[PDB]
C-alpha cells in the first residue's frame, strides 16, 4: 500500500509499504530515499508518536494515510 | 464553549473559550495546553488566517468548530 | 553570544556564536551539539528562511535571538 509522509514544511513523500511493516522498517525506507538516518527521525500519526518495535497496523495506518516526519535530537 | 484545534502533527486539542475571546487569547490558551509559543502559531478557520486583534465571533466560530495550526512561513 | 535554536516539537538548544558567524558555521555547530547534518537542516528566523553565504549580522540575529530548526 501507498502512504504519505509529510514534513512540517509541506514536502510530501510517498512510500510503498505493507501493514505488517514495522516502524523501524519504514524509517529505513525513508533513509534510503531521503538520506535521513533513523535516529534523526520521529514519525507521528494523528498526534501519536510511533514506536520502533510496532507495526503500521498497530496504529491503523492504511492506504493513503498521512504520517508526519519531524526531526529527532540525541538529547531529544 | 469548546472548540477544537488541529496541531501541526495532527493532534487534536480541546480549548475552553468564549466568543468574545480574541485570537491572541486563544494563542495563549494553546500555549498553556500544548506549550506551543504564540510566535509559532498561525491559525486557520475555513481557509482564512485569523488576525490577532479580532474575536472568534467575528469569524463565525461556533461551539465545536475546528481550527488548524499551520506553519507560519514567508519567503523572505 | 548565546542564541536559542528551537524545534517546532518542543526542544531548545543553546548555542554560543558571534555575529560574524556564517549560517553554515551555525549549522556545523548544530551538527555537533546534535548529529543533524547541515543539508538536512532548515533554519528560520522570525519567518525568514536562512540561506548559505550570510552571517547572523546580515539577518540581524542578536544575542538571545530564537531561531527555529525544522527538517
Short mmCIF file of C-alpha atoms in Angstrom, two decimals:
data_model
loop_
_atom_site.label_atom_id
_atom_site.label_comp_id
_atom_site.label_asym_id
_atom_site.label_seq_id
_atom_site.Cartn_x
_atom_site.Cartn_y
_atom_site.Cartn_z
CA UNK A 1 0.00 0.00 0.00
CA UNK A 2 0.81 3.60 -0.54
CA UNK A 3 1.20 6.02 2.41
CA UNK A 4 2.19 9.63 2.53
CA UNK A 5 4.83 11.15 4.76
CA UNK A 6 4.72 14.88 5.29
CA UNK A 7 7.35 17.17 6.76
CA UNK A 8 6.50 20.43 8.53
CA UNK A 9 7.42 22.48 5.53
CA UNK A 10 4.80 20.71 3.38
CA UNK A 11 7.20 18.48 1.47
CA UNK A 12 5.36 15.17 0.99
CA UNK A 13 6.82 11.84 0.12
CA UNK A 14 5.06 8.64 -0.93
CA UNK A 15 6.18 5.19 0.23
CA UNK A 16 5.11 1.66 -0.67
CA UNK A 17 4.62 -0.42 2.37
CA UNK A 18 2.73 -3.32 3.86
CA UNK A 19 0.56 -3.13 7.01
CA UNK A 20 2.83 -5.57 8.89
CA UNK A 21 5.93 -3.39 8.25
CA UNK A 22 7.45 -2.20 11.49
CA UNK A 23 8.14 1.41 12.18
CA UNK A 24 11.92 0.78 12.06
CA UNK A 25 11.39 -0.75 8.64
CA UNK A 26 9.52 2.41 7.46
CA UNK A 27 12.26 4.60 8.88
CA UNK A 28 14.85 2.58 6.91
CA UNK A 29 12.83 3.15 3.70
CA UNK A 30 12.78 6.87 4.48
CA UNK A 31 16.58 6.73 4.89
CA UNK A 32 17.00 5.01 1.55
CA UNK A 33 15.13 7.57 -0.38
CA UNK A 34 15.93 10.77 1.53
CA UNK A 35 19.22 10.13 3.36
CA UNK A 36 17.94 10.80 6.87
CA UNK A 37 19.19 8.29 9.36
CA UNK A 38 16.59 6.62 11.54
CA UNK A 39 17.90 8.15 14.76
CA UNK A 40 17.09 11.61 13.42
CA UNK A 41 13.54 10.60 12.53
CA UNK A 42 10.46 10.91 14.60
CA UNK A 43 7.27 9.70 12.93
CA UNK A 44 3.87 10.76 14.03
CA UNK A 45 0.41 9.69 13.08
CA UNK A 46 -2.67 11.67 14.19
CA UNK A 47 -0.64 13.27 17.05
CA UNK A 48 0.68 9.86 18.16
CA UNK A 49 4.40 9.22 18.23
CA UNK A 50 5.16 5.89 16.51
CA UNK A 51 7.37 3.35 18.37
CA UNK A 52 10.13 1.46 16.52
CA UNK A 53 9.05 -2.06 17.54
CA UNK A 54 5.44 -1.86 16.45
CA UNK A 55 3.80 -2.15 13.01
CA UNK A 56 1.76 0.17 10.85
CA UNK A 57 -1.38 -1.95 11.59
CA UNK A 58 -0.93 -1.41 15.35
CA UNK A 59 -1.79 2.26 14.64
CA UNK A 60 -4.47 1.60 11.95
CA UNK A 61 -2.33 3.13 9.27
CA UNK A 62 -3.89 2.30 5.92
CA UNK A 63 -3.97 3.02 2.22
CA UNK A 64 -3.35 6.75 1.69
CA UNK A 65 -2.84 7.59 5.40
CA UNK A 66 -0.62 10.56 6.16
CA UNK A 67 2.24 10.38 8.61
CA UNK A 68 4.39 13.24 9.81
CA UNK A 69 8.11 13.22 9.74
CA UNK A 70 9.95 15.58 12.18
CA UNK A 71 13.48 15.90 13.48
CA UNK A 72 14.67 13.90 16.45
CA UNK A 73 17.54 15.13 18.60
CA UNK A 74 20.00 12.86 20.55
CA UNK A 75 19.11 14.50 23.84
CA UNK A 76 15.60 14.59 22.33
CA UNK B 1 -17.83 26.74 24.79
CA UNK B 2 -15.48 24.18 23.30
CA UNK B 3 -13.51 24.43 20.16
CA UNK B 4 -11.01 22.10 18.62
CA UNK B 5 -7.54 22.78 17.29
CA UNK B 6 -5.51 20.56 14.99
CA UNK B 7 -1.79 20.88 15.65
CA UNK B 8 0.89 20.61 13.03
CA UNK B 9 1.43 16.88 13.67
CA UNK B 10 -2.29 16.05 13.64
CA UNK B 11 -3.01 16.06 17.36
CA UNK B 12 -6.46 17.44 18.32
CA UNK B 13 -6.69 19.60 21.43
CA UNK B 14 -9.79 20.98 23.01
CA UNK B 15 -9.97 24.57 24.31
CA UNK B 16 -12.49 26.19 26.59
CA UNK B 17 -13.25 29.57 25.09
CA UNK B 18 -15.87 32.35 24.80
CA UNK B 19 -16.96 34.09 21.58
CA UNK B 20 -15.50 37.40 22.74
CA UNK B 21 -12.04 35.80 23.09
CA UNK B 22 -9.52 37.37 20.80
CA UNK B 23 -7.21 35.30 18.65
CA UNK B 24 -4.25 36.31 20.92
CA UNK B 25 -6.08 34.98 23.94
CA UNK B 26 -6.68 31.69 22.03
CA UNK B 27 -2.96 31.52 21.12
CA UNK B 28 -2.06 31.90 24.80
CA UNK B 29 -4.57 29.21 25.82
CA UNK B 30 -2.97 26.91 23.24
CA UNK B 31 0.46 27.62 24.84
CA UNK B 32 -0.90 26.73 28.32
CA UNK B 33 -2.21 23.41 26.98
CA UNK B 34 0.40 22.32 24.45
CA UNK B 35 3.41 24.53 25.21
CA UNK B 36 3.48 25.96 21.66
CA UNK B 37 4.83 29.53 21.68
CA UNK B 38 2.43 32.21 20.24
CA UNK B 39 5.03 33.50 17.75
CA UNK B 40 4.97 29.97 16.29
CA UNK B 41 1.14 29.72 15.91
CA UNK B 42 -0.61 30.56 12.69
CA UNK B 43 -4.39 29.72 12.96
CA UNK B 44 -6.77 28.98 10.14
CA UNK B 45 -10.58 28.58 10.06
CA UNK B 46 -12.44 27.95 6.78
CA UNK B 47 -9.21 28.62 4.78
CA UNK B 48 -8.66 32.10 6.26
CA UNK B 49 -5.91 33.20 8.60
CA UNK B 50 -7.14 34.56 11.93
CA UNK B 51 -5.87 38.13 12.59
CA UNK B 52 -4.55 38.70 16.12
CA UNK B 53 -6.83 41.63 17.09
CA UNK B 54 -10.18 40.03 16.14
CA UNK B 55 -12.54 37.77 18.04
CA UNK B 56 -13.85 34.26 17.44
CA UNK B 57 -17.39 35.63 16.94
CA UNK B 58 -16.04 37.88 14.12
CA UNK B 59 -15.27 34.78 12.14
CA UNK B 60 -18.49 32.95 12.98
CA UNK B 61 -16.52 30.46 15.05
CA UNK B 62 -19.23 28.42 16.89
CA UNK B 63 -19.07 25.73 19.51
CA UNK B 64 -17.27 22.60 18.35
CA UNK B 65 -15.67 24.37 15.44
CA UNK B 66 -12.18 23.16 14.38
CA UNK B 67 -9.21 25.42 13.72
CA UNK B 68 -5.95 24.39 12.16
CA UNK B 69 -2.44 25.36 13.15
CA UNK B 70 -0.24 25.77 10.15
CA UNK B 71 3.33 26.64 9.72
CA UNK B 72 3.96 30.36 9.59
CA UNK B 73 6.20 30.84 6.58
CA UNK B 74 7.11 33.79 4.50
CA UNK B 75 9.52 33.61 1.55
CA UNK B 76 11.89 36.44 2.68
CA UNK C 1 26.93 35.23 22.29
CA UNK C 2 24.16 32.78 23.17
CA UNK C 3 21.31 32.04 20.73
CA UNK C 4 18.44 29.65 21.13
CA UNK C 5 17.60 27.08 18.46
CA UNK C 6 14.06 25.70 18.82
CA UNK C 7 12.38 22.85 17.03
CA UNK C 8 8.64 23.13 16.41
CA UNK C 9 8.17 19.99 18.52
CA UNK C 10 9.33 21.41 21.85
CA UNK C 11 13.14 21.20 22.33
CA UNK C 12 15.56 24.06 22.81
CA UNK C 13 19.27 24.15 22.02
CA UNK C 14 21.56 26.88 23.32
CA UNK C 15 24.46 27.75 21.01
CA UNK C 16 27.48 30.02 21.55
CA UNK C 17 28.18 32.13 18.43
CA UNK C 18 29.45 35.53 17.28
CA UNK C 19 27.66 37.86 14.79
CA UNK C 20 30.28 37.23 12.08
CA UNK C 21 29.46 33.51 12.07
CA UNK C 22 28.02 32.27 8.79
CA UNK C 23 24.81 30.24 8.54
CA UNK C 24 26.88 27.25 7.50
CA UNK C 25 29.04 27.68 10.65
CA UNK C 26 25.95 27.73 12.76
CA UNK C 27 24.69 24.53 11.08
CA UNK C 28 28.07 22.89 11.76
CA UNK C 29 27.65 23.79 15.49
CA UNK C 30 24.19 22.25 15.41
CA UNK C 31 25.67 19.15 13.66
CA UNK C 32 27.89 18.81 16.73
CA UNK C 33 25.54 19.51 19.75
CA UNK C 34 23.38 17.05 17.94
CA UNK C 35 24.37 14.96 14.86
CA UNK C 36 21.98 16.60 12.41
CA UNK C 37 23.89 17.11 9.20
CA UNK C 38 23.60 20.56 7.70
CA UNK C 39 21.93 19.53 4.42
CA UNK C 40 19.06 18.14 6.44
CA UNK C 41 18.66 21.44 8.38
CA UNK C 42 16.36 24.39 7.68
CA UNK C 43 16.84 27.39 9.97
CA UNK C 44 14.17 30.02 10.28
CA UNK C 45 14.48 33.44 11.99
CA UNK C 46 11.17 35.18 12.65
CA UNK C 47 9.61 33.77 9.47
CA UNK C 48 12.67 34.13 7.12
CA UNK C 49 14.48 31.00 5.92
CA UNK C 50 18.21 31.49 6.32
CA UNK C 51 20.47 30.91 3.40
CA UNK C 52 24.02 29.89 2.95
CA UNK C 53 26.55 32.65 2.50
CA UNK C 54 25.10 35.08 5.04
CA UNK C 55 26.12 35.89 8.54
CA UNK C 56 24.00 36.34 11.63
CA UNK C 57 24.58 40.12 11.43
CA UNK C 58 23.25 40.10 7.86
CA UNK C 59 19.97 38.82 9.23
CA UNK C 60 20.28 40.93 12.37
CA UNK C 61 20.37 37.98 14.68
CA UNK C 62 21.37 39.34 18.08
CA UNK C 63 22.32 37.52 21.25
CA UNK C 64 19.44 35.62 22.86
CA UNK C 65 17.68 35.51 19.45
CA UNK C 66 15.48 32.50 18.79
CA UNK C 67 15.95 30.51 15.59
CA UNK C 68 13.67 27.63 14.55
CA UNK C 69 15.07 24.44 13.20
CA UNK C 70 12.97 22.14 11.04
CA UNK C 71 13.68 19.12 8.83
#
